Amino acid sequence: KGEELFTGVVPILVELDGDVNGHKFSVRGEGEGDATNGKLTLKFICTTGKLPVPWPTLVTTLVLCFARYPDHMKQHDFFKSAMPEGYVQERTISFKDDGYYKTRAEVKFEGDTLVNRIELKGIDFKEDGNILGHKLEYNFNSSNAYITADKQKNGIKSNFKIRHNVEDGSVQLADHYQQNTPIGDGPVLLPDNHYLSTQNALSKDPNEKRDHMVLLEFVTAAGI
C-alpha cells in the first residue's frame, strides 16, 4: 500500500546538519519527485553562509523512494513499501586519500511531504585536499549501484562508487557503503539483487546570491 502514496508529484523537504573537521553547516532543500517517471527536481541552500565542502560531495546524501521501478520489479521496491512510516538510511562515504563522511537520515512522510532529515559527520579530512580545498568540478557523473536484501535487518544494503571530477583533470573516488532499515513494524518488500541507475545534472540559479545547488535527477531500477 506504500506505493500508492507516490502517484503524481510529491513535494519534498530535505534538511541536513553537518560537521566536517569541526566546520559546522546546515543545508535546506525543497522540490518535488515524480516516481512514475523517476524524476526529481530540487534546489538546496546553505543556511550557514558558505558551504565548507563542495556541493557535488553531498548529492547522494541529500530519496530513493522516487526511483522508477518497472512493473515486473514492483515486488522488489523496498523504499516505497516502508512508507509512510519510513526508513533509516545510513552511509559511510570514504574519499580516497582523504577523509570520510558518516551519515544517518530518516526518510518518511510528514503530512503530504516526503522529508529527508540528515545528520552528517566528516572526519580526517585534509584542510588543503580536494574536499576542504574546494578543488572539485561543479558537475556529476552517471552512476550504477547494486541493491541487495539484508534479510536479518528487514532491509537492504548497497556498496557503490561515485567519481568526482577534480579541477586538475584527475578523478576523486568516493566509495559508498549504504544500509537501510524500516522505521515501522509493518511488513516491507525484501528485493532480489538488482541495480539502480542514476543520471544527474547540476546547475545554478542566475539571480541567487546564496550558496546553492539546483539539481535534476533521474533514477531507474533494472534487473540483472
Side-chain angles (χ1 to χ4, degrees), residues 61-105:
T61 301
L62 297 166
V63 291
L64 296 169
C65 44
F66 289 103
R68 177 175 81 85
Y69 269 77
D71 283 78
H72 65 285
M73 294 183 72
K74 290 252 149 84
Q75 309 261 254
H76 307 280
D77 189 349
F78 163 88
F79 307 101
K80 287 185 194 65
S81 78
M83 293 300 158
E85 284 181 285
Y87 55 76
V88 178
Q89 175 159 297
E90 288 158 328
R91 291 218 185 83
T92 304
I93 306 175
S94 307
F95 296 88
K96 181 181 189 311
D97 299 315
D98 211 330
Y100 58 98
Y101 296 162
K102 265 294 207 208
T103 72
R104 178 191 192 275

mmCIF file of all heavy atoms in Angstrom, residues 61-105:
data_model
loop_
_atom_site.group_PDB
_atom_site.id
_atom_site.type_symbol
_atom_site.label_atom_id
_atom_site.label_comp_id
_atom_site.label_asym_id
_atom_site.label_seq_id
_atom_site.Cartn_x
_atom_site.Cartn_y
_atom_site.Cartn_z
ATOM 1 N N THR A 61 23.873 12.156 -0.400
ATOM 2 C CA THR A 61 23.328 12.242 0.956
ATOM 3 C C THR A 61 22.009 12.999 0.949
ATOM 4 O O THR A 61 21.031 12.579 1.583
ATOM 5 C CB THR A 61 24.340 12.941 1.876
ATOM 6 O OG1 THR A 61 25.587 12.211 1.884
ATOM 7 C CG2 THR A 61 23.793 13.079 3.308
ATOM 8 N N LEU A 62 21.971 14.110 0.222
ATOM 9 C CA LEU A 62 20.769 14.917 0.050
ATOM 10 C C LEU A 62 19.693 14.143 -0.721
ATOM 11 O O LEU A 62 18.492 14.338 -0.511
ATOM 12 C CB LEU A 62 21.123 16.228 -0.686
ATOM 13 C CG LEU A 62 22.087 17.147 0.081
ATOM 14 C CD1 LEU A 62 22.687 18.279 -0.805
ATOM 15 C CD2 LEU A 62 21.413 17.693 1.348
ATOM 16 N N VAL A 63 16.653 10.202 -1.530
ATOM 17 C CA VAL A 63 15.222 9.897 -1.509
ATOM 18 C C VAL A 63 14.867 8.838 -2.557
ATOM 19 O O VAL A 63 14.113 9.079 -3.515
ATOM 20 C CB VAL A 63 14.390 11.191 -1.658
ATOM 21 C CG1 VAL A 63 14.529 12.053 -0.382
ATOM 22 C CG2 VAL A 63 14.827 12.010 -2.885
ATOM 23 N N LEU A 64 15.422 7.640 -2.352
ATOM 24 C CA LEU A 64 15.311 6.572 -3.345
ATOM 25 C C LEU A 64 13.905 6.008 -3.464
ATOM 26 O O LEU A 64 13.673 5.176 -4.349
ATOM 27 C CB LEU A 64 16.293 5.444 -3.009
ATOM 28 C CG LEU A 64 17.743 5.892 -3.103
ATOM 29 C CD1 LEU A 64 18.676 4.838 -2.508
ATOM 30 C CD2 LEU A 64 18.089 6.185 -4.575
ATOM 31 N N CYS A 65 12.965 6.432 -2.604
ATOM 32 C CA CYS A 65 11.566 6.080 -2.827
ATOM 33 C C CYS A 65 11.013 6.677 -4.119
ATOM 34 O O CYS A 65 9.917 6.296 -4.535
ATOM 35 C CB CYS A 65 10.704 6.533 -1.644
ATOM 36 S SG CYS A 65 11.121 8.189 -1.113
ATOM 37 N N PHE A 66 11.728 7.589 -4.766
ATOM 38 C CA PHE A 66 11.251 8.153 -6.029
ATOM 39 C C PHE A 66 11.833 7.455 -7.249
ATOM 40 O O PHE A 66 11.595 7.899 -8.373
ATOM 41 C CB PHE A 66 11.545 9.647 -6.076
ATOM 42 C CG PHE A 66 10.677 10.441 -5.132
ATOM 43 C CD1 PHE A 66 11.187 10.910 -3.924
ATOM 44 C CD2 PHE A 66 9.342 10.680 -5.439
ATOM 45 C CE1 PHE A 66 10.395 11.617 -3.033
ATOM 46 C CE2 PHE A 66 8.529 11.390 -4.553
ATOM 47 C CZ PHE A 66 9.059 11.855 -3.339
ATOM 48 N N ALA A 67 12.592 6.376 -7.048
ATOM 49 C CA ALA A 67 13.071 5.573 -8.163
ATOM 50 C C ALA A 67 11.903 5.050 -8.990
ATOM 51 O O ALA A 67 10.837 4.722 -8.461
ATOM 52 C CB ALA A 67 13.904 4.406 -7.640
ATOM 53 N N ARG A 68 12.098 4.969 -10.301
ATOM 54 C CA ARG A 68 11.118 4.289 -11.139
ATOM 55 C C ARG A 68 11.419 2.795 -11.127
ATOM 56 O O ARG A 68 12.454 2.357 -11.635
ATOM 57 C CB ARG A 68 11.124 4.822 -12.567
ATOM 58 C CG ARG A 68 10.143 4.044 -13.449
ATOM 59 C CD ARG A 68 10.019 4.615 -14.852
ATOM 60 N NE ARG A 68 11.106 4.179 -15.725
ATOM 61 C CZ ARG A 68 11.119 3.033 -16.408
ATOM 62 N NH1 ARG A 68 10.101 2.179 -16.323
ATOM 63 N NH2 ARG A 68 12.162 2.736 -17.179
ATOM 64 N N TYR A 69 10.529 2.011 -10.533
ATOM 65 C CA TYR A 69 10.666 0.573 -10.589
ATOM 66 C C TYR A 69 9.777 0.060 -11.705
ATOM 67 O O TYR A 69 8.578 0.372 -11.705
ATOM 68 C CB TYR A 69 10.280 -0.061 -9.257
ATOM 69 C CG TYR A 69 11.460 -0.207 -8.327
ATOM 70 C CD1 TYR A 69 11.957 0.891 -7.641
ATOM 71 C CD2 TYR A 69 12.092 -1.436 -8.148
ATOM 72 C CE1 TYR A 69 13.055 0.778 -6.791
ATOM 73 C CE2 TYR A 69 13.205 -1.560 -7.295
ATOM 74 C CZ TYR A 69 13.673 -0.442 -6.624
ATOM 75 O OH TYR A 69 14.756 -0.538 -5.770
ATOM 76 N N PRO A 70 10.318 -0.663 -12.688
ATOM 77 C CA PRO A 70 9.478 -1.240 -13.743
ATOM 78 C C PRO A 70 8.463 -2.221 -13.179
ATOM 79 O O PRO A 70 8.630 -2.783 -12.093
ATOM 80 C CB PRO A 70 10.486 -1.950 -14.657
ATOM 81 C CG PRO A 70 11.776 -1.248 -14.407
ATOM 82 C CD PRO A 70 11.751 -0.883 -12.947
ATOM 83 N N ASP A 71 7.404 -2.442 -13.964
ATOM 84 C CA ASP A 71 6.239 -3.167 -13.466
ATOM 85 C C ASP A 71 6.604 -4.567 -12.990
ATOM 86 O O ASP A 71 6.119 -5.018 -11.945
ATOM 87 C CB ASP A 71 5.162 -3.229 -14.544
ATOM 88 C CG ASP A 71 4.415 -1.922 -14.680
ATOM 89 O OD1 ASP A 71 4.969 -0.985 -15.299
ATOM 90 O OD2 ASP A 71 3.277 -1.833 -14.167
ATOM 91 N N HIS A 72 7.466 -5.267 -13.725
ATOM 92 C CA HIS A 72 7.826 -6.611 -13.283
ATOM 93 C C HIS A 72 8.730 -6.605 -12.054
ATOM 94 O O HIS A 72 9.062 -7.682 -11.544
ATOM 95 C CB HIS A 72 8.496 -7.384 -14.426
ATOM 96 C CG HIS A 72 9.817 -6.820 -14.856
ATOM 97 N ND1 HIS A 72 9.927 -5.668 -15.607
ATOM 98 C CD2 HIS A 72 11.083 -7.254 -14.644
ATOM 99 C CE1 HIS A 72 11.205 -5.415 -15.837
ATOM 100 N NE2 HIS A 72 11.927 -6.361 -15.260
ATOM 101 N N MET A 73 9.140 -5.433 -11.572
ATOM 102 C CA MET A 73 10.003 -5.325 -10.405
ATOM 103 C C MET A 73 9.303 -4.674 -9.223
ATOM 104 O O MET A 73 9.954 -4.392 -8.209
ATOM 105 C CB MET A 73 11.263 -4.533 -10.751
ATOM 106 C CG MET A 73 12.149 -5.219 -11.741
ATOM 107 S SD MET A 73 13.639 -4.283 -12.048
ATOM 108 C CE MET A 73 14.548 -4.499 -10.521
ATOM 109 N N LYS A 74 7.993 -4.429 -9.326
ATOM 110 C CA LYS A 74 7.303 -3.687 -8.277
ATOM 111 C C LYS A 74 7.329 -4.411 -6.938
ATOM 112 O O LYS A 74 7.195 -3.759 -5.894
ATOM 113 C CB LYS A 74 5.866 -3.395 -8.705
ATOM 114 C CG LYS A 74 5.785 -2.377 -9.832
ATOM 115 C CD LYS A 74 5.264 -1.034 -9.354
ATOM 116 C CE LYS A 74 5.858 0.110 -10.176
ATOM 117 N NZ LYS A 74 5.115 0.350 -11.446
ATOM 118 N N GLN A 75 7.507 -5.735 -6.943
ATOM 119 C CA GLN A 75 7.612 -6.514 -5.712
ATOM 120 C C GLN A 75 8.991 -6.425 -5.074
ATOM 121 O O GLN A 75 9.214 -7.046 -4.028
ATOM 122 C CB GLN A 75 7.267 -7.985 -5.978
ATOM 123 C CG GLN A 75 5.946 -8.209 -6.723
ATOM 124 C CD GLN A 75 4.788 -8.571 -5.805
ATOM 125 O OE1 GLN A 75 4.351 -9.725 -5.767
ATOM 126 N NE2 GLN A 75 4.273 -7.580 -5.072
ATOM 127 N N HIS A 76 9.912 -5.676 -5.680
ATOM 128 C CA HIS A 76 11.270 -5.515 -5.183
ATOM 129 C C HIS A 76 11.568 -4.083 -4.743
ATOM 130 O O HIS A 76 12.733 -3.742 -4.524
ATOM 131 C CB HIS A 76 12.262 -5.975 -6.252
ATOM 132 C CG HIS A 76 11.978 -7.356 -6.766
ATOM 133 N ND1 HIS A 76 12.347 -8.495 -6.083
ATOM 134 C CD2 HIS A 76 11.333 -7.779 -7.881
ATOM 135 C CE1 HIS A 76 11.951 -9.560 -6.758
ATOM 136 N NE2 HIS A 76 11.334 -9.153 -7.853
ATOM 137 N N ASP A 77 10.539 -3.248 -4.599
ATOM 138 C CA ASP A 77 10.688 -1.836 -4.239
ATOM 139 C C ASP A 77 10.566 -1.741 -2.717
ATOM 140 O O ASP A 77 9.486 -1.525 -2.168
ATOM 141 C CB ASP A 77 9.639 -1.010 -4.982
ATOM 142 C CG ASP A 77 9.848 0.502 -4.855
ATOM 143 O OD1 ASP A 77 10.683 0.938 -4.033
ATOM 144 O OD2 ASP A 77 9.162 1.252 -5.586
ATOM 145 N N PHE A 78 11.694 -1.931 -2.025
ATOM 146 C CA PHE A 78 11.712 -1.785 -0.571
ATOM 147 C C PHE A 78 11.311 -0.378 -0.156
ATOM 148 O O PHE A 78 10.537 -0.189 0.794
ATOM 149 C CB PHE A 78 13.109 -2.125 -0.031
ATOM 150 C CG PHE A 78 13.359 -1.636 1.384
ATOM 151 C CD1 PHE A 78 13.012 -2.419 2.478
ATOM 152 C CD2 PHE A 78 13.947 -0.400 1.621
ATOM 153 C CE1 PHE A 78 13.235 -1.964 3.786
ATOM 154 C CE2 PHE A 78 14.161 0.062 2.917
ATOM 155 C CZ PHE A 78 13.808 -0.731 4.005
ATOM 156 N N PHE A 79 11.830 0.620 -0.864
ATOM 157 C CA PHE A 79 11.766 2.007 -0.409
ATOM 158 C C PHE A 79 10.329 2.497 -0.270
ATOM 159 O O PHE A 79 9.970 3.116 0.736
ATOM 160 C CB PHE A 79 12.562 2.899 -1.373
ATOM 161 C CG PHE A 79 13.969 2.418 -1.602
ATOM 162 C CD1 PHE A 79 14.304 1.726 -2.761
ATOM 163 C CD2 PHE A 79 14.955 2.654 -0.655
ATOM 164 C CE1 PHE A 79 15.605 1.272 -2.970
ATOM 165 C CE2 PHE A 79 16.257 2.203 -0.856
ATOM 166 C CZ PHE A 79 16.576 1.512 -2.015
ATOM 167 N N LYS A 80 9.489 2.232 -1.271
ATOM 168 C CA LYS A 80 8.103 2.668 -1.169
ATOM 169 C C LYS A 80 7.335 1.819 -0.166
ATOM 170 O O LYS A 80 6.500 2.343 0.585
ATOM 171 C CB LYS A 80 7.435 2.619 -2.547
ATOM 172 C CG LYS A 80 7.907 3.718 -3.487
ATOM 173 C CD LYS A 80 7.117 3.672 -4.802
ATOM 174 C CE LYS A 80 7.778 4.515 -5.909
ATOM 175 N NZ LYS A 80 9.112 4.002 -6.331
ATOM 176 N N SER A 81 7.626 0.509 -0.117
ATOM 177 C CA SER A 81 6.905 -0.391 0.784
ATOM 178 C C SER A 81 7.041 0.009 2.254
ATOM 179 O O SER A 81 6.168 -0.327 3.064
ATOM 180 C CB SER A 81 7.394 -1.824 0.596
ATOM 181 O OG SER A 81 8.635 -2.028 1.258
ATOM 182 N N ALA A 82 8.103 0.723 2.620
ATOM 183 C CA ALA A 82 8.289 1.123 4.008
ATOM 184 C C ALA A 82 7.498 2.366 4.377
ATOM 185 O O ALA A 82 7.465 2.719 5.559
ATOM 186 C CB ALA A 82 9.775 1.353 4.295
ATOM 187 N N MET A 83 6.866 3.026 3.408
ATOM 188 C CA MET A 83 6.145 4.263 3.634
ATOM 189 C C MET A 83 4.731 3.988 4.146
ATOM 190 O O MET A 83 4.164 2.926 3.890
ATOM 191 C CB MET A 83 6.091 5.065 2.341
ATOM 192 C CG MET A 83 7.468 5.560 1.909
ATOM 193 S SD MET A 83 8.243 6.627 3.151
ATOM 194 C CE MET A 83 9.977 6.448 2.652
ATOM 195 N N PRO A 84 4.121 4.944 4.863
ATOM 196 C CA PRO A 84 4.625 6.281 5.178
ATOM 197 C C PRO A 84 5.512 6.341 6.418
ATOM 198 O O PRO A 84 6.129 7.384 6.650
ATOM 199 C CB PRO A 84 3.341 7.079 5.382
ATOM 200 C CG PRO A 84 2.382 6.072 5.927
ATOM 201 C CD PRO A 84 2.729 4.758 5.316
ATOM 202 N N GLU A 85 5.591 5.254 7.198
ATOM 203 C CA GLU A 85 6.380 5.304 8.427
ATOM 204 C C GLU A 85 7.852 5.555 8.130
ATOM 205 O O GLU A 85 8.538 6.236 8.897
ATOM 206 C CB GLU A 85 6.206 4.015 9.223
ATOM 207 C CG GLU A 85 4.877 3.930 9.953
ATOM 208 C CD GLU A 85 4.759 2.649 10.761
ATOM 209 O OE1 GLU A 85 4.535 1.580 10.146
ATOM 210 O OE2 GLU A 85 4.915 2.707 12.005
ATOM 211 N N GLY A 86 8.353 5.010 7.028
ATOM 212 C CA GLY A 86 9.651 5.397 6.507
ATOM 213 C C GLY A 86 10.760 4.399 6.790
ATOM 214 O O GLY A 86 10.544 3.252 7.194
ATOM 215 N N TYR A 87 11.989 4.869 6.559
ATOM 216 C CA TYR A 87 13.172 4.053 6.771
ATOM 217 C C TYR A 87 14.337 4.936 7.205
ATOM 218 O O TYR A 87 14.347 6.150 6.983
ATOM 219 C CB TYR A 87 13.549 3.257 5.507
ATOM 220 C CG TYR A 87 13.742 4.075 4.233
ATOM 221 C CD1 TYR A 87 14.897 4.835 4.025
ATOM 222 C CD2 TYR A 87 12.787 4.044 3.216
ATOM 223 C CE1 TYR A 87 15.089 5.556 2.827
ATOM 224 C CE2 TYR A 87 12.963 4.768 2.022
ATOM 225 C CZ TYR A 87 14.111 5.509 1.835
ATOM 226 O OH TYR A 87 14.268 6.211 0.656
ATOM 227 N N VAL A 88 15.317 4.294 7.838
ATOM 228 C CA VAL A 88 16.597 4.909 8.157
ATOM 229 C C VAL A 88 17.572 4.569 7.042
ATOM 230 O O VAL A 88 17.628 3.421 6.587
ATOM 231 C CB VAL A 88 17.123 4.413 9.519
ATOM 232 C CG1 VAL A 88 18.502 5.018 9.823
ATOM 233 C CG2 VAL A 88 16.140 4.732 10.636
ATOM 234 N N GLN A 89 18.329 5.568 6.578
ATOM 235 C CA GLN A 89 19.387 5.360 5.592
ATOM 236 C C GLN A 89 20.703 5.809 6.216
ATOM 237 O O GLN A 89 20.835 6.973 6.605
ATOM 238 C CB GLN A 89 19.118 6.147 4.308
ATOM 239 C CG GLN A 89 20.243 6.074 3.269
ATOM 240 C CD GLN A 89 19.740 6.403 1.885
ATOM 241 O OE1 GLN A 89 18.881 5.696 1.331
ATOM 242 N NE2 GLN A 89 20.265 7.482 1.314
ATOM 243 N N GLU A 90 21.667 4.899 6.301
ATOM 244 C CA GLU A 90 22.975 5.173 6.884
ATOM 245 C C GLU A 90 24.056 4.891 5.854
ATOM 246 O O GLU A 90 23.980 3.894 5.130
ATOM 247 C CB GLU A 90 23.218 4.314 8.156
ATOM 248 C CG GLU A 90 22.382 4.762 9.348
ATOM 249 C CD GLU A 90 22.171 3.673 10.425
ATOM 250 O OE1 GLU A 90 22.099 2.469 10.095
ATOM 251 O OE2 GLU A 90 22.064 4.040 11.611
ATOM 252 N N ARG A 91 25.075 5.764 5.800
ATOM 253 C CA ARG A 91 26.174 5.579 4.870
ATOM 254 C C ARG A 91 27.515 5.881 5.529
ATOM 255 O O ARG A 91 27.610 6.680 6.465
ATOM 256 C CB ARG A 91 26.031 6.475 3.627
ATOM 257 C CG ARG A 91 24.898 6.107 2.689
ATOM 258 C CD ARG A 91 25.384 6.320 1.247
ATOM 259 N NE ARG A 91 24.354 6.107 0.225
ATOM 260 C CZ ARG A 91 23.458 7.029 -0.150
ATOM 261 N NH1 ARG A 91 23.431 8.215 0.442
ATOM 262 N NH2 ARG A 91 22.587 6.766 -1.120
ATOM 263 N N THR A 92 28.551 5.234 5.006
ATOM 264 C CA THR A 92 29.931 5.681 5.127
ATOM 265 C C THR A 92 30.405 6.039 3.728
ATOM 266 O O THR A 92 30.269 5.229 2.808
ATOM 267 C CB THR A 92 30.827 4.583 5.718
ATOM 268 O OG1 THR A 92 30.296 4.169 6.979
ATOM 269 C CG2 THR A 92 32.242 5.085 5.916
ATOM 270 N N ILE A 93 30.941 7.245 3.559
ATOM 271 C CA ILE A 93 31.470 7.680 2.269
ATOM 272 C C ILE A 93 32.952 7.979 2.472
ATOM 273 O O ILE A 93 33.302 8.934 3.175
ATOM 274 C CB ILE A 93 30.729 8.902 1.709
ATOM 275 C CG1 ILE A 93 29.214 8.649 1.646
ATOM 276 C CG2 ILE A 93 31.307 9.276 0.326
ATOM 277 C CD1 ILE A 93 28.413 9.902 1.205
ATOM 278 N N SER A 94 33.821 7.163 1.863
ATOM 279 C CA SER A 94 35.265 7.289 2.028
ATOM 280 C C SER A 94 35.866 7.934 0.788
ATOM 281 O O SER A 94 35.762 7.385 -0.312
ATOM 282 C CB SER A 94 35.915 5.923 2.267
ATOM 283 O OG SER A 94 35.297 5.252 3.340
ATOM 284 N N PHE A 95 36.497 9.092 0.961
ATOM 285 C CA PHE A 95 37.135 9.768 -0.158
ATOM 286 C C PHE A 95 38.584 9.297 -0.227
ATOM 287 O O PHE A 95 39.330 9.449 0.744
ATOM 288 C CB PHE A 95 37.034 11.284 0.005
ATOM 289 C CG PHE A 95 35.617 11.797 -0.018
ATOM 290 C CD1 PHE A 95 34.868 11.866 1.156
ATOM 291 C CD2 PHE A 95 35.029 12.194 -1.221
ATOM 292 C CE1 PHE A 95 33.546 12.336 1.135
ATOM 293 C CE2 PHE A 95 33.712 12.671 -1.256
ATOM 294 C CZ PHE A 95 32.968 12.731 -0.076
ATOM 295 N N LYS A 96 38.966 8.694 -1.350
ATOM 296 C CA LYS A 96 40.294 8.092 -1.449
ATOM 297 C C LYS A 96 41.383 9.132 -1.197
ATOM 298 O O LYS A 96 41.335 10.244 -1.738
ATOM 299 C CB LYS A 96 40.471 7.441 -2.820
ATOM 300 C CG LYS A 96 41.815 6.758 -3.020
ATOM 301 C CD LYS A 96 41.906 6.168 -4.421
ATOM 302 C CE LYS A 96 43.133 5.292 -4.587
ATOM 303 N NZ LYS A 96 44.361 5.958 -4.094
ATOM 304 N N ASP A 97 42.342 8.772 -0.336
ATOM 305 C CA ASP A 97 43.459 9.640 0.069
ATOM 306 C C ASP A 97 42.987 10.905 0.791
ATOM 307 O O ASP A 97 43.681 11.920 0.799
ATOM 308 C CB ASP A 97 44.349 9.999 -1.131
ATOM 309 C CG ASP A 97 44.970 8.764 -1.784
ATOM 310 O OD1 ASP A 97 45.470 7.882 -1.056
ATOM 311 O OD2 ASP A 97 44.935 8.663 -3.023
ATOM 312 N N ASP A 98 41.819 10.858 1.420
ATOM 313 C CA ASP A 98 41.292 11.996 2.178
ATOM 314 C C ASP A 98 40.400 11.428 3.284
ATOM 315 O O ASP A 98 40.554 10.269 3.675
ATOM 316 C CB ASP A 98 40.582 12.990 1.234
ATOM 317 C CG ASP A 98 40.675 14.445 1.718
ATOM 318 O OD1 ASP A 98 40.745 14.692 2.937
ATOM 319 O OD2 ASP A 98 40.646 15.355 0.873
ATOM 320 N N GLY A 99 39.467 12.223 3.793
ATOM 321 C CA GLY A 99 38.662 11.830 4.934
ATOM 322 C C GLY A 99 37.425 11.042 4.549
ATOM 323 O O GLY A 99 37.304 10.534 3.432
ATOM 324 N N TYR A 100 36.484 10.935 5.497
ATOM 325 C CA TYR A 100 35.253 10.190 5.228
ATOM 326 C C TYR A 100 34.049 10.838 5.920
ATOM 327 O O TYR A 100 34.184 11.462 6.968
ATOM 328 C CB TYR A 100 35.411 8.705 5.642
ATOM 329 C CG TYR A 100 35.769 8.478 7.096
ATOM 330 C CD1 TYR A 100 34.786 8.152 8.034
ATOM 331 C CD2 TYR A 100 37.088 8.584 7.535
ATOM 332 C CE1 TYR A 100 35.112 7.938 9.380
ATOM 333 C CE2 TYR A 100 37.425 8.379 8.880
ATOM 334 C CZ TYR A 100 36.437 8.054 9.792
ATOM 335 O OH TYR A 100 36.774 7.856 11.117
ATOM 336 N N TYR A 101 32.867 10.706 5.288
ATOM 337 C CA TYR A 101 31.583 11.113 5.852
ATOM 338 C C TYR A 101 30.900 9.913 6.506
ATOM 339 O O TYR A 101 30.962 8.789 5.992
ATOM 340 C CB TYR A 101 30.611 11.653 4.792
ATOM 341 C CG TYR A 101 30.988 12.937 4.048
ATOM 342 C CD1 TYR A 101 30.358 13.262 2.846
ATOM 343 C CD2 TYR A 101 31.914 13.837 4.565
ATOM 344 C CE1 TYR A 101 30.668 14.446 2.155
ATOM 345 C CE2 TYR A 101 32.229 15.027 3.880
ATOM 346 C CZ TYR A 101 31.597 15.323 2.684
ATOM 347 O OH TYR A 101 31.904 16.498 2.013
ATOM 348 N N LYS A 102 30.226 10.170 7.620
ATOM 349 C CA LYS A 102 29.270 9.253 8.228
ATOM 350 C C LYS A 102 27.927 9.950 8.243
ATOM 351 O O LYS A 102 27.828 11.053 8.785
ATOM 352 C CB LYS A 102 29.643 8.920 9.683
ATOM 353 C CG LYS A 102 30.436 7.664 9.851
ATOM 354 C CD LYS A 102 29.632 6.449 9.484
ATOM 355 C CE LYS A 102 30.154 5.271 10.263
ATOM 356 N NZ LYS A 102 29.943 3.986 9.565
ATOM 357 N N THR A 103 26.892 9.302 7.705
ATOM 358 C CA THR A 103 25.578 9.935 7.613
ATOM 359 C C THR A 103 24.485 9.031 8.174
ATOM 360 O O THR A 103 24.519 7.807 8.008
ATOM 361 C CB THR A 103 25.233 10.347 6.151
ATOM 362 O OG1 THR A 103 24.955 9.198 5.329
ATOM 363 C CG2 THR A 103 26.384 11.096 5.541
ATOM 364 N N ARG A 104 23.520 9.650 8.852
ATOM 365 C CA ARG A 104 22.301 8.976 9.282
ATOM 366 C C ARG A 104 21.102 9.854 8.942
ATOM 367 O O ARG A 104 21.025 11.003 9.392
ATOM 368 C CB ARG A 104 22.329 8.669 10.782
ATOM 369 C CG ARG A 104 21.031 8.011 11.271
ATOM 370 C CD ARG A 104 20.945 7.937 12.809
ATOM 371 N NE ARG A 104 19.850 7.054 13.214
ATOM 372 C CZ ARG A 104 18.583 7.438 13.337
ATOM 373 N NH1 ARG A 104 18.248 8.700 13.096
ATOM 374 N NH2 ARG A 104 17.651 6.564 13.702
ATOM 375 N N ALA A 105 20.154 9.291 8.190
ATOM 376 C CA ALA A 105 18.971 10.004 7.733
ATOM 377 C C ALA A 105 17.720 9.222 8.088
ATOM 378 O O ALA A 105 17.739 7.991 8.204
ATOM 379 C CB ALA A 105 18.981 10.233 6.206
#
